[PDB]
Amino acid sequence: SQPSTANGGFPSVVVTAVTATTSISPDIESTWKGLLAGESGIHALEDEFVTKWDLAVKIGGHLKDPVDSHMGRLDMRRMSYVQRMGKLLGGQLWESAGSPEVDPDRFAVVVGTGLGGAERIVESYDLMNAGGPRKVSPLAVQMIMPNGAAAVIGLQLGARAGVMTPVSACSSGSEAIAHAWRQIVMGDADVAVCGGVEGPIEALPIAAFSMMRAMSTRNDEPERASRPFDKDRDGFVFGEAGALMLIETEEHAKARGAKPLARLLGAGITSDAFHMVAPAADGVRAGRAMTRSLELAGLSPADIDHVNAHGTATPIGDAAEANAIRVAGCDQAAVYAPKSALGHSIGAVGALESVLTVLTLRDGVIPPTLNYETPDPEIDLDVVAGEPRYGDYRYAVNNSFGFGGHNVALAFGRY
Amino acid sequence: SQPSTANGGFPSVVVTAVTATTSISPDIESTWKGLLAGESGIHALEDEFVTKWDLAVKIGGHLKDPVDSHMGRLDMRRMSYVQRMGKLLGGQLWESAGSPEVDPDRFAVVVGTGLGGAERIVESYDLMNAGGPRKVSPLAVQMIMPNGAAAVIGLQLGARAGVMTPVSACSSGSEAIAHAWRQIVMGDADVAVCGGVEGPIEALPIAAFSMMRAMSTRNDEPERASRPFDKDRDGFVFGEAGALMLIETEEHAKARGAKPLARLLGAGITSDAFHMVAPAADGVRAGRAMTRSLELAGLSPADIDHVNAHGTATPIGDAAEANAIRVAGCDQAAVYAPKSALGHSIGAVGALESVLTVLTLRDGVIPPTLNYETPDPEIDLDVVAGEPRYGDYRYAVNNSFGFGGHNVALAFGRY
Ligand SMILES: O=S(=O)(CCCC(F)(F)F)Nc1ccc2cnccc2c1
Ligand SMILES: O=S(=O)(CCCC(F)(F)F)Nc1ccc2cnccc2c1
Ligand code: NA
Ligand code: NA
């Protein structure tokens, strides 16, 4: 008689607020409406570094509204980028939540990132070489450490029931939400701010990722380069993003009159032990990740109406996920690959895509998967394309698969 | 009622093997004998970079046995230092546990770290500035990503029940152990490889932490510089380290004839939300990390015989920890500050001090806190000093407190 959300073994956890900054818009609800209208965030990069280095990739989605356009001189001096993004999203999230007065002792922050304050390592390196060890800021360490974002958000909001930073590359954002859920169901907290943040698009990131040969080079037509599950896909597209959601026990959200957006029912974490950067082709462990989220939710595969696919738009990546969705027996669910419109935000993407899974369940709609024009004959899923599909989505699984063979799956339900 | 290890709510988890590379020795058992003999791995740094920059800190503990002396030309070109450490310790641990055949679908890896593959960031940055984006390695991303060490260990040992990497600075190693324990009691695995790994001593690391005023500069007596809880303390000393342990359910241990070295009973994670690098002076949330560890273990503070303190030798750090142990009502316990001997491993250190906490319970002996000469009235603790302290220690807490206000306590028990 193992514990599940269904059988009361875990307390009921609800999502009571969300925030995201995006290539389409700084406002999640605008981003949502824009996705339903079939808008894409992916453009031709106009940054000088592109033409300075003659990079193979000249496309991506910068945030519609730069994080640093909201950051004064002080904040530019004492925070890394992911920190400054985290402070911004943290404040937006709380205001959206009605600036609630919670017990800081029962309040956790779990925010993942791909890399950390990496640019401050480079800057400290350059300053030290030009002028010696005393040119390194006494702030260098607090900005460089990859727990910086979560620590800045925790300090900002007064989270005293734990501040955590899981790192698993592309799945970091989803993993953070998994761990926030655990922290609540195990009794360590009643409310948790969780999600992901990531750095902007730049020369060195593109260089690194494009030399892996995992990126689309369809530079002629930016808006059509991201092609999850399409026969002509040639890898992923950068799409800057950041996302937090507020979760709390249903008791808690009720005690303060907060109207839930959805339920976070269960969470699955597994691994491939196959390759450092390529997903196991059989999708077996990735599927178990999904199956596990259902065990803890108390759901069976037949209950899943929707799947928010990883949808990297790599050849081997989409084939792998196809096999996973079959292995978990969720292949009759309506699939959506939001990376088609928003692109890959690495450490942030798993949390943005959880925010879309929540809204999907709230509004009862899945936006269209852009650029799905020649479905891959070797992949037989129900990819939503063309126009938004209004459906009775009671339960969804959001997938995330990280470099290192990390598999995370989040089980969500309608309120 | 609430599930506690004592009341059978969580399955009994056991430590069945351990491994560490330290400044005293590559062989953990040799390190443990040297600590009881009163030895110190902190020597004067002979490194060129000391002289080139004339660093204020000229003292530190390199590994007795450098990682790269065991590493081929291909590994040196294909992995980040921390991965190379992770591979080496993963193999040593596996061998020490008798190379057991385990179900990969119930076998997790949780290895934390401080920074990640940082050297690959600067190197990639330098190569690209030199000869353009083509000069960045196709392996750059897997080497840089902080989850890289955890990944490599998971792939080397075939862990498929999840590979995870918590980053919480100085507490990363202890946090890795806390999540592996969770992974097991929530039922996601039966056997975990967990601990932490960290990069070597170098110019920028010393500049970075020096400039916070965090580090001891007592260069003329390197083996006396690290003075946890002592009146004349003046900051921490770098001591290179990596540490891993094998934990598993008692049931799983029994069934393969593995001899338990100790029990892992409970794990608390709290946060100060006080300051980015200063611990809260009151020690309340720190102590509540200890308290939480005992709730889950089913112990009362009165049952705690030993505490394996953070003991960084920072003036404000030790003060706060002393109050933390007072709030946890564990201030009756025989206290040890291993950093006195082995220095500060940052990411690794919690993993290391967790292993030393195991061997303390196994052998009924606490080593002496080196350089404890002038009791601080602000620290009213029973700090073990002078001669080892022998006794029937049944229950021990291992404290870690990271920059960013992350507090990890681990409840351990004699087998
Ligand atoms: O994976 S990353 O390299 C880029 C991700 C890009 C995008 F997908 F669009 F989000 N992460 C970071 C992290 C910190 C950085 C700080 N300064 C400059 C770039 C950074 C990129
Ligand atoms: O905290 S760190 O800066 C120094 C480690 C401290 C200690 F281990 F205790 F000595 N971490 C790293 C990480 C990666 C590195 C790769 N190459 C050079 C140095 C590195 C330091
Ligand atoms: Na997804
Ligand atoms: Na300790």
From Swiss-Prot, chains A, B:
Subcellular location: Cytoplasm
Mutation effect (F412L): Increases resistance to isoniazid
Impact noted for substituting G311S: Increases resistance to isoniazid
Reactions catalysed: an ultra-long-chain mono-unsaturated fatty acyl-[ACP] + malonyl-[ACP] + H(+) = a 3-oxo-ultra-long-chain mono-unsaturated fatty acyl-[ACP] + holo-[ACP] + CO2; hexadecanoyl-[ACP] + malonyl-[ACP] + H(+) = 3-oxooctadecanoyl-[ACP] + holo-[ACP] + CO2
Effect of K339A: Loss of activity with hexadecanoyl-CoA
PROSITE patterns in the cross-refs: KS3_2
Activity control note: Phosphorylation decreases the condensation activity.
Alphabetical list of Pfam families matching this protein: ketoacyl-synt, Ketoacyl-synt_C
SUPFAM superfamilies: Thiolase-like
Entry's Gene Ontology cellular component terms: cytosol; peptidoglycan-based cell wall; plasma membrane
Effect on the protein upon substituting D65N: Increases resistance to isoniazid
Residues at which substrate binds: H310, H344
Annotated ranges, domain Ketosynthase family 3 (KS3): 10-414
NCBIfam families, alphabetized: PRK07314.1, PRK07910.1
Misc. remarks from the entry: Identified as a drug target. Inhibited by isoniazid (INH), thiolactomycin (TLM) and related analogs. Highly sensitive to cerulenin. Is the biological target of GSK3011724A, an indazole sulfonamide. Inhibited by the indazole JSF-3285, which is a promising preclinical candidate for tuberculosis.
Primary role: Part of the mycobacterial fatty acid elongation system FAS-II, which is involved in mycolic acid biosynthesis. Catalyzes the elongation of long chain acyl-ACP substrates by the addition of two carbons from malonyl-ACP to an acyl acceptor. Involved in the initial extension of the mycolate chain and forms monounsaturated fatty acids that averaged 40 carbons in length.
Name of the protein this chain belongs to: 3-oxoacyl-[acyl-carrier-protein] synthase 1
Species: Mycobacterium tuberculosis (strain ATCC 25618 / H37Rv)
Gene this chain is encoded by: kasA
